[PDB]
Design a protein around this ligand. Structure first.
Ligand SMILES: CC(C)NP(=O)(O)NC(C)C
Ligand SMILES: CC(C)NP(=O)(O)NC(C)C
Ligand SMILES: [Ba+2]
Ligand SMILES: [Ba+2]
Ligand SMILES: [Ba+2]
Ligand SMILES: [Mn+2]
Ligand SMILES: [Mn+2]
Ligand SMILES: [Mn+2]
Ligand SMILES: [Mn+2]
Ligand SMILES: [Mn+2]
Ligand SMILES: [Mn+2]
Ligand SMILES: [Mn+2]
Lengths: 422, 428
């Protein structure tokens, strides 16, 4: 039951609010869910995306014009938008709820003296019209983002659920790929098994076949299946109550050959890497180990004619693994706080020290990218590359294997692999 | 006939329109900004991109931010085409109608624009960006009004594009209707539709309305139930399709068993709808058809004995608006609810109502969407007035579980004939 954990979640957020509003001499904090954005010269709207700082309090992620007023001592106030034009859950009990019928009528529900209420939201003009003066003050943002990195038990439960949903999608997509479906059909299967509409996914799914696996930010879906099937890379997640999953699997169509061997080797490394998560360990250290294991893979597979250490030393591994090893995840897919050393807020996304109750992705990759390979060929590192072998693996695109892992004090919970996603 | 051939005449037409408006407004030229990607608050995700309708009026490029068209109508239009270069990430028929220049980063655009921007109209959303570039004429009304007025007269290219949008949507509607009769859920029916049209959700020109039972009475229903209802009674689906920036906008209503009072109601509305389609004609005000719809809705109410009055009495007492609360339809094209539908002249003067009021002409494209609904709120208001006595509330109660009815086609008006794109593609 989520309701039991949720009670503790509110209590934690109230505690956090109490601390920062005392420290920064405020009366309260006002969290603005957001608004509907209208398309230029049109009467159509973009899909609504809630303020992360709003939904941090409660699973209301599809409602604009909502407001939260909290001071950490009284019950948080919730202004809940609810129009009446002809066109009650467990969390409700924890707020004093006021219903709003028209957004411009919010002004009589907010504090008369807004001088010392920090407005937390996107809409600065609306805030100033209402009478707010302090908007998104850095000390306050920094403080919340720092503590967003420690997930309450409520949040962990939500994140286990989002993972479980995503893992059903990933399996359906995997099966669809082995049946030789198009990227577009694979995506439909993924949406169907997760019961997600496209604007429900926490990010735009990456569903790639063959050469497209090397396109790191690939977003399209081919409606036409490839003449031959070689490789498949799916990076997709899911939402539960505002919390995200973010999972990548890569597959060889045949299960035999050098690329299939490459994939399984990357998988052992990625599991090894996961298991190095531990309290009191700088995340950056794992990112260094990943370049080393990637160096060793390139050497072992005779993609590069050097020892693993020499590949690292000559700066060759960045050509094949050009992004960070991972990141915090939670309410945002690339979650906040991943750079902060303290509450004050003093390439690689996470450098912060690992601790209990933090949640991570571990996503080593190995790609054969056109422009990066062209750069290397121009350097003195030309002599060392096995160009014949790059040509061989090129048609398969690349590889990424990505899990979501919760760190505990004396254990790790790899959510994705504990769900038996191979 | 083929799109490539028709497009040549489309460009020539846009050039001619540009020449007249810049000459009249004393401009040097017009600049269409496709738009930009919008970042989510405190995040590094983006909203889905939506192109400036005035930009895609020129060419079928709808997924590309940071593009600019510089037109004056005499020289070939200059296209500034965004094409970034990084490891993370133009040869079709329309390309050689533009003087094209590639832009590898958005902040490098100042170079490619006119050095003196004083008499160039900026047509776009990003006012402050455009000001910083030096533009000072932001979306000038005389120019907006003028382009939006002529948007009502589709070129042959645009007509062909809209026939393809309609073709694709009709596929979706057939898959959806089949899915309905198999007792599927709203969410599974929407999936069938997206499959048949090969559209991602953000490709549809609007958010699909896929409603079962009482949900059919929620005009702006947007959710997709994951759970099939225990009893299937009714289905209403309002859904379109994009082709090259042009929209289709189709609605069908179905009864599950195809027998009974609600099923006969659908059949009756269908016949009214078809009769209203054939009322489109050059010279007629679209208002004249809107009033006929109300007459016909009043006639349905009278015949089915939902209201105990003659059709004419029902209209006089203003009762039909309880059951048909919206407009008969609207222009359609680049925008779903297309521009120019209220304008009486190029100066943007308002044709007064008795949405769309403008005098109908050849080459314009309309929706026709009569509907009849049983809406709690509106029936509640009806129960408060001195028209209480005239309503059969028992029959209303029996029909309420079916939600409502809408039937919507996209029709082209020709000088001598009408072209119902939707019924031509065999969607009954
Ligand atoms: C959310 C996902 C699609 N992006 P990522 O954080 O897994 N970055 C990858 C491209 C390395
Ligand atoms: C475009 C669609 C979603 N709505 P509509 O203009 O076809 N009809 C109205 C009455 C809902
Ligand atoms: Ba070997
Ligand atoms: Ba070997
Ligand atoms: Ba060593
Ligand atoms: Mn105080
Ligand atoms: Mn005070
Ligand atoms: Mn990912
Ligand atoms: Mn990730
Ligand atoms: Mn001609
Ligand atoms: Mn419609
Ligand atoms: Mn319509």
């Amino acid at each position: 039951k989520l309701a039991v954990l949720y009670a503790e979640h509110i209590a934690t957020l109230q505690k956090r609010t109490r601390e920062i509003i005392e420290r920064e001499n405020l009366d309260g904090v006002v969290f603005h869910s957001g608004q509907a954005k209208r398309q230029f010269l049109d009467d159509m709207y973009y899909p609504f995306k809630v303020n992360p700082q709003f939904k941090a309090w409660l699973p209301v992620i599809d409602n604009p014009h909502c407001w939260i007023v909290a001071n950490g001592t009284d019950k948080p106030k919730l202004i809940f938008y609810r129009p009446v034009d002809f066109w009650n859950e467990y969390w409700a009990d924890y707020f004093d709820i006021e219903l709003l019928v028209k957004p411009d009528q919010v002004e009589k529900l907010l504090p008369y003296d807004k001088a010392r209420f920090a407005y937390i939201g996107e809409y600065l003009e609306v805030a100033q019209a209402l009478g707010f003066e302090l908007m998104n003050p850095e000390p306050v943002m920094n403080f919340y983002h720092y503590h967003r990195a420690y997930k309450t038990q409520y949040e962990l439960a939500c994140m286990r659920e989002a993972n479980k949903i995503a893992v059903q999608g990933h399996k359906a997509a995997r099966d669809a790929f082995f049946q030789g479906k198009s990227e577009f059909e694979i995506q439909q299967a993924y949406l169907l098994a997760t019961q997600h509409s496209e604007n429900d996914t926490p990010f735009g799914n990456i569903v790639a076949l063959n050469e497209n696996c090397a396109i790191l930010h690939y977003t399209h879906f081919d409606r036409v299946a490839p003449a031959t099937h070689r490789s498949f890379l799916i990076d997709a997640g899911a939402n539960f109550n505002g919390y995200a999953a973010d999972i990548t699997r890569t597959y060889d169509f045949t299960g035999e050959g050098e690329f299939a061997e490459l994939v399984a080797t990357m998988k052992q490394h990625q599991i090894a890497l996961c298991n190095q998560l531990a309290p009191g360990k700088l995340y950056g250290e794992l990112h260094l180990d990943c370049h080393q294991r990637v160096a060793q893979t390139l050497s072992d597979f005779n993609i590069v004619n050097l020892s693993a250490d020499e590949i690292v030393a000559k700066g060759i591994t960045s050509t094949f693994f050009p992004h960070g090893l991972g990141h915090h995840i939670g309410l945002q897919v690339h979650d906040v706080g991943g750079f902060m050393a303290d509450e004050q807020g003093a390439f690689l996304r996470c450098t912060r020290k690992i601790e209990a109750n933090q949640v991570f992705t571990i996503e080593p990759g190995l790609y054969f990218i056109d422009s990066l390979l062209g750069d290397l060929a121009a350097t003195d590192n030309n002599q060392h590359i096995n160009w014949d072998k790059v040509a061989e693996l090129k048609p398969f695109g690349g590889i990424r294997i990505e899990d979501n892992i919760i760190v505990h004090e004396d254990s790790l919970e790899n959510m994705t692999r504990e769900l038996e996603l191979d």
